[PDB]
């Protein structure tokens, strides 16, 4: 694979968002991945609606959590592949309460046909990401609250508790790293991003990687 990749260099990644006090990280991880995959299939970059998942995907648990893989499955099996625009279905769960689903009057921003669950191996995930784009991952983020910047070497790596988006890596750096988009505003971390050391399963990053498939 290339020594380094950063999909932000192509304009493939939307701006950092804010999940607020809702346990909706699963939705931000899944939607961020769909946004990037939609752009990379040769279509324009479009902000898509976490709130569609939080309120309407009844196979997940709203502000009480979910699974990116369930989200991808709901989109295909229950929503005809469709993902609405953020522009047409804005986030409304910042206080921790998910409002009931609105089915009407949103606008379709993207479609997907399925998803893949990637091998539990950082080199294999990197190789897939280098060609196919950003990848949704679960991590242990219990040690992340106080992170401000640099390449994390000390991640507490015990229990998956958070969903984020891998957008790149750099194997040529003094400490090789992953580049991860979070959903905790641009005030957190490196303008909303974190770098973690690559190659030692930091934060359990290899354990539950997946992506939407766009035709």
Ligand X SMILES: *CC(=O)[C@H](CCCC)n1cc([C@@](C)(NCc2ccc3ncccc3c2)C(C)C)nn1
Q: In sequence order, what are the residues at sequence separation of 6 or more whose Cβ sits closer than 8 angstroms to the Cβ of residue 200?
A: none
Kindly report the number of other CB atoms within 10 A of residue 174's CB atom: 7
**Nearest distance in Å: CB 60, ligand X:** 5
Site membership for ligand X, residue 26 (CB under 6 A): yes
Site membership for ligand X, residue 32 (CB under 6 A): no
- Here the tokens at position 203 are 């934060």
DSSP 52-93: HHHHH-TTS-TTB---HHHHHHHHHHHSTTEEEBTTTS----
Residue 115 designated active-site: no
- Here the tokens at position 205 are 């990053």
Residue 43 designated active-site: no
Closer residue to ligand X (CB): 28 or 84: 28
**Nearest distance in Å: CB 24, ligand X:** 6
Please report, as residue ranges, which positions from 147 to 176 form the binding site for ligand X (by CB under 6 A).
160-163
Cα-to-chain-centroid distance, residue 76:
18
Site membership for ligand X, residue 86 (CB under 6 A): no
Binds ligand X (CB under 6 A): choice among 5, 17, 23, 193: 23
Kindly report the number of other CB atoms within 10 A of residue 172's CB atom: 9
Closer residue to ligand X (CB): 67 or 75: 67
Closer residue to ligand X (CB): 61 or 124: 61
Task: Give the residue from 93, 91, 88 showing the smallest Cα distance to 104.
Answer: 88
Of 22, 25, 56, 63, catalytic? 25
Residue 182 designated active-site: yes
Only one of the segments 21-29, 103-111, 170-178, 186-194 lies at the binding site for ligand X (rule: CB under 6 A); that segment is 21-29
Please report, as residue ranges, which positions from 45 to 74 form the binding site for ligand X (by CB under 6 A).
60-61, 64-67, 70
Q: What are the angstrom distances between the C-alpha of 80 and each of 5, 87, 107?
A: 32, 20, 14
Of 36, 162, 170, 203, catalytic? 162
Task: Give the residue from 136, 140, 148, 213 showing the smallest Cα distance to 180.
Answer: 136
Binds ligand X (CB under 6 A): choice among 25, 49, 126, 152: 25
Cα–Cα distance for residue pair 34/205, rounded to 1 Å: 19
Contact 167, 179 (CB under 8 A): yes
The residues carrying an active-site annotation are 25, 162, 182
* Residues of the shown chain interacting with ligand X in the complex, contacts defined by CB under 6 A: 23-26, 60-61, 64-67, 70, 138, 160-163
């Amino acid at each position: 694979a290339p020594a380094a990749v950063d999909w932000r260099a192509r304009g493939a990644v939307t701006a950092v968002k804010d999940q607020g006090q809702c346990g909706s990280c699963w939705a931000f991880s899944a939607i961020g991945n769909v946004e990037c995959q939609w752009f990379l299939a040769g279509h324009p970059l479009t902000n898509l609606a976490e709130q569609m998942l939080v309120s309407c995907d009844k196979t997940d648990s709203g502000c009480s959590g979910g699974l990116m893989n369930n989200a991808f499955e709901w989109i295909v099996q229950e929503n005809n592949g469709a993902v609405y625009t953020e522009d047409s279905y804005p986030y409304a769960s910042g206080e921790g309460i998910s409002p009931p689903c609105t089915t009407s009057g949103h606008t379709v921003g993207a479609t997907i046909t399925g998803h893949v669950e990637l091998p539990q191996d950082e080199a294999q995930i990197a190789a897939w990401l280098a060609v196919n784009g950003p990848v949704a991952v679960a991590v242990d983020a219990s040690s992340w609250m106080t992170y401000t910047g640099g390449v994390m070497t000390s991640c507490v790596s015990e229990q998956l508790d958070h969903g984020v988006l891998l957008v790149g890596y750099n194997d040529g750096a003094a400490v090789p790293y992953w580049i991860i988009k979070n959903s905790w505003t641009t005030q957190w971390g490196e303008e909303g991003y974190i770098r973690i050391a690559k190659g030692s399963n930091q934060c359990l990053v290899k354990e539950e990687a997946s992506s939407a498939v766009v035709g």
